[PDB]
Amino acid sequence: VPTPTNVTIESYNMNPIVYWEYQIMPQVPVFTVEVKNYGVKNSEWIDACINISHHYCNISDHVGDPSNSLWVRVKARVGQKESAYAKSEEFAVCRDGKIGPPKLDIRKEEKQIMIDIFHPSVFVNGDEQEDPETTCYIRVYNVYVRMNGSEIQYKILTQKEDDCDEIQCQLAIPVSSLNSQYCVSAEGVLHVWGVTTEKSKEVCITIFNS
Amino acid sequence: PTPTNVTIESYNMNPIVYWEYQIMPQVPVFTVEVKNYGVKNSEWIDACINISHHYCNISDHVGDPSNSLWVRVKARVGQKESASEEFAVCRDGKIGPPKLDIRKEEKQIMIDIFHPSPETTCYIRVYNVYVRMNGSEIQYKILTQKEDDCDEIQCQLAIPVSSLNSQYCVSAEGVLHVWGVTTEKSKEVCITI
Amino acid sequence: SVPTPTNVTIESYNMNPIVYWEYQIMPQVPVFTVEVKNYGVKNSEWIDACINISHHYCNISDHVGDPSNSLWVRVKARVGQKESAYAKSEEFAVCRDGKIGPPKLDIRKEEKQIMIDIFHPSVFVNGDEQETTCYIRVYNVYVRMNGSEIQYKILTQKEDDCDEIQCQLAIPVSSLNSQYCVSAEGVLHVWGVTTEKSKEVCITI
Amino acid sequence: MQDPYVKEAENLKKYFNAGHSDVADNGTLFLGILKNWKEESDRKIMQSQIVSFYFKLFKNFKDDQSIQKSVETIKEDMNVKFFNSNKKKRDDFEKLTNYSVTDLNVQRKAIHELIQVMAELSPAAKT
Amino acid sequence: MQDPYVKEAENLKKYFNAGHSDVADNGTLFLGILKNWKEESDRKIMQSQIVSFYFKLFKNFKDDQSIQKSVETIKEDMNVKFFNSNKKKRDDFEKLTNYSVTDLNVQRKAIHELIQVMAELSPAAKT
């Protein structure tokens, strides 16, 4: 029978879904998507979704180390006749996906505003997997702070630095340039490819002192 | 009638022609033509022809970013068309700031200054790295040329972990050759030691 | 036998080897020249240790680099103006092939324990300012008391009793008997050559 | 911040068409083995063979002008990361990697320095 | 008494005729280089290439019977000293040393695992 078209993997918060088109056939066809991920013992592919009727497939249980490229292929069957496979390009979760923003918290302590950057949902978990032994973690957080009418970034090493921990990150700031409405937003940057997480929505605060 | 208040504008080396025009029941089109000094003969060049909007990205008419150009524009209503501060793209105005990065290696903060994104004089000669902390802005000169910290991509500048401070803040501007035009000063990028 | 030196032989003690060679007697007094070449030569040239000498020995101490790096020395003669072919020593390796002086022992007392100080042999104990895998690995401390001997190994490396200068080895005041007698030999890294066993520095009765 | 070399690594990756299904077949050369070792010394007794390998590879490709800029770029970064920017280290390493194991004199010279060599490749630690 | 291997090392030494004046000519292959590095990690980034070399050498000499007992004997001791009697280590090492840098598929597979290989080259703090 005909061949699937425009195969595409996509990921968010680490769980990719294979997508593919198909022309409308007389009888409703089924599909089978198979995943093969680099570092295969031999050369066998894996059936992710066997003879499915839809046009998508959540391959979460084929995403090993989120840095190890995988290729998925799909086919159809109808009449009883199957077709040739459709090949996705090499996908790499960590290089090719996107991760939700971190969760920011601003507040106050005498002469300093405190900022809490809770690591994106995915990472904070107490691993079961569904971040030991994977270079796919956040290395630097970019805390931006907008005040009066000026802006300053703030690197933060989640590793070589003891502000962060398995849960959050800290960043104190001096009550600067007299007047307030400090506005905080932050993005995460990943190891190896250096892909940014989503930049959180601005969570401001206002100060009045003398 | 005729287009009004024509204006070219450029940022990070790519100018767009802008012009007004009176409203009327009819939608007219426009044609912007660029002529840049050092023309073989004397022909103009069509940048955007029969366009409906009021702007024009002439990027492919910007030869040497120092060689003056003049652009002209007109309209067409149905079938009724209508009848030196040198300022170099590279020489004048402002090209954005470089790209700063800060980190750490025992006892020394490292600063990378990626140059703003052959054989011309229009390059960065000295990068002005400013470093702020507790109570002291403190500059640094970097000579992209007579110095082997810089290379075709970046520049370096280590710093000793100074005066028991906490937050250090780096910012930097590029200084152009010949004319000495500064690039845009980057937004600060602090750290926390 | 004719005009070439015979039975060449290097020999060393406390790290300073001397080349020795025979030669037939004859009405004329000949001179000799001993040349040393030691492994890890920049190019291929030999070195003159003693030139036009009349005797039958040569202290090559200033050709002994790292005491573990094999060297070969050759010697010849000159009779008036008639030199001869060279005589070749076999590959010599100071550390493998030499012999060394004993360590320096010190016994004493502390409450229920005799303390023993084994100062590494003179050669090693220097500081490297004046004239290598070649070091002491295990010191064999023998301790004699009443009529019974007992030895003790001791690893100068994997052990923090030794240091660039000495070594330590406490002992419990054993079998009702005093008059302990200590002696000690060193053993070397790679060839396992013992140093000279020091003379006894007994203690008490 | 993207590391300069990934760009060039991926670039090369296209050139060799390593980004394609099949490549996934038959275990992994480095990646996994390098994963069984976390003690730095060991990581180094393996990374060494891995760098000498990429070193042969890029060598047998210096004729290929099309990927040169990529291959030099990767190389400097490997120097900066593995040889810790230590010019000697690189140079010593290099020397060792180029020794005709068949040059009849090179095998004598080496058979000579064996004992001395083997008297020191046993992890040592005292200072 | 001398470590079991020195005997066999000197034995080999005769076979190759490495104890003759000439061998002393032209610097030293290993010995000196290995002397410029005392930090164990580095000592290992070099000793690795030195063991792989003796490894090729003894390989191109297994076809010979006269020195076999010596060559196996030296080898075990090298295993016990360098690979710290760790059967895996040896086996991983071995694998890495035998990869056809020309097997057209081996070079793709490796160009694939490059970026990943480079992202663990440097030493870590949290492993």
PDB file of C-alpha atoms in Angstrom, chain D residues 29 33-34 36-37 42-43 45-46 49 121, chain E residues 47-60 62 71-99:
ATOM      1  CA  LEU D  29      33.007   1.851  20.126  1.00  0.00           C
ATOM      2  CA  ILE D  33      33.553   1.529  27.623  1.00  0.00           C
ATOM      3  CA  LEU D  34      34.319   5.051  28.682  1.00  0.00           C
ATOM      4  CA  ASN D  36      32.593   1.750  32.893  1.00  0.00           C
ATOM      5  CA  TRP D  37      35.366   4.006  34.218  1.00  0.00           C
ATOM      6  CA  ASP D  42      41.511   4.905  34.215  1.00  0.00           C
ATOM      7  CA  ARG D  43      39.412   7.271  32.189  1.00  0.00           C
ATOM      8  CA  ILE D  45      44.193   4.976  30.149  1.00  0.00           C
ATOM      9  CA  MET D  46      41.281   4.671  27.645  1.00  0.00           C
ATOM     10  CA  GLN D  49      43.671   5.245  22.836  1.00  0.00           C
ATOM     11  CA  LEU D 121      53.665   1.644  35.146  1.00  0.00           C
TER      12      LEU D 121
ATOM     13  CA  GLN E  47      51.933   4.696  29.649  1.00  0.00           C
ATOM     14  CA  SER E  48      48.862   3.747  27.663  1.00  0.00           C
ATOM     15  CA  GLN E  49      50.579   4.424  24.289  1.00  0.00           C
ATOM     16  CA  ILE E  50      53.727   2.725  25.671  1.00  0.00           C
ATOM     17  CA  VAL E  51      51.809  -0.467  26.557  1.00  0.00           C
ATOM     18  CA  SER E  52      49.920  -0.552  23.287  1.00  0.00           C
ATOM     19  CA  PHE E  53      53.326  -0.315  21.599  1.00  0.00           C
ATOM     20  CA  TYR E  54      54.877  -3.222  23.485  1.00  0.00           C
ATOM     21  CA  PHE E  55      51.612  -4.915  22.674  1.00  0.00           C
ATOM     22  CA  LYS E  56      51.981  -4.548  18.882  1.00  0.00           C
ATOM     23  CA  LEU E  57      55.705  -5.564  19.236  1.00  0.00           C
ATOM     24  CA  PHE E  58      55.101  -8.830  21.070  1.00  0.00           C
ATOM     25  CA  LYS E  59      52.242  -9.500  18.584  1.00  0.00           C
ATOM     26  CA  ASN E  60      54.516  -9.264  15.556  1.00  0.00           C
ATOM     27  CA  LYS E  62      54.146 -14.575  18.369  1.00  0.00           C
ATOM     28  CA  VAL E  71      56.820 -12.613  26.086  1.00  0.00           C
ATOM     29  CA  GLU E  72      53.816 -14.150  27.877  1.00  0.00           C
ATOM     30  CA  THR E  73      55.616 -13.764  31.190  1.00  0.00           C
ATOM     31  CA  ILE E  74      56.312 -10.118  30.608  1.00  0.00           C
ATOM     32  CA  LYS E  75      52.723  -9.583  29.504  1.00  0.00           C
ATOM     33  CA  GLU E  76      51.007 -11.005  32.603  1.00  0.00           C
ATOM     34  CA  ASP E  77      53.174  -8.837  34.840  1.00  0.00           C
ATOM     35  CA  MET E  78      52.251  -5.809  32.690  1.00  0.00           C
ATOM     36  CA  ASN E  79      48.608  -6.784  33.228  1.00  0.00           C
ATOM     37  CA  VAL E  80      49.084  -7.059  36.962  1.00  0.00           C
ATOM     38  CA  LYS E  81      50.905  -3.727  37.047  1.00  0.00           C
ATOM     39  CA  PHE E  82      49.166  -1.480  34.603  1.00  0.00           C
ATOM     40  CA  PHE E  83      45.669  -2.889  34.460  1.00  0.00           C
ATOM     41  CA  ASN E  84      45.850  -3.562  38.183  1.00  0.00           C
ATOM     42  CA  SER E  85      44.783  -7.191  37.682  1.00  0.00           C
ATOM     43  CA  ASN E  86      41.407  -5.871  36.467  1.00  0.00           C
ATOM     44  CA  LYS E  87      40.224  -8.285  33.736  1.00  0.00           C
ATOM     45  CA  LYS E  88      37.731  -5.751  32.398  1.00  0.00           C
ATOM     46  CA  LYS E  89      40.241  -2.932  32.079  1.00  0.00           C
ATOM     47  CA  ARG E  90      42.556  -5.118  30.034  1.00  0.00           C
ATOM     48  CA  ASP E  91      39.645  -6.258  27.842  1.00  0.00           C
ATOM     49  CA  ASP E  92      38.294  -2.764  27.311  1.00  0.00           C
ATOM     50  CA  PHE E  93      41.796  -1.505  26.551  1.00  0.00           C
ATOM     51  CA  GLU E  94      42.328  -4.340  24.082  1.00  0.00           C
ATOM     52  CA  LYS E  95      39.101  -3.604  22.242  1.00  0.00           C
ATOM     53  CA  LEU E  96      40.082   0.061  21.836  1.00  0.00           C
ATOM     54  CA  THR E  97      43.451  -0.803  20.505  1.00  0.00           C
ATOM     55  CA  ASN E  98      42.024  -2.995  17.756  1.00  0.00           C
ATOM     56  CA  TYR E  99      39.669  -0.918  15.597  1.00  0.00           C
TER      57      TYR E  99
END
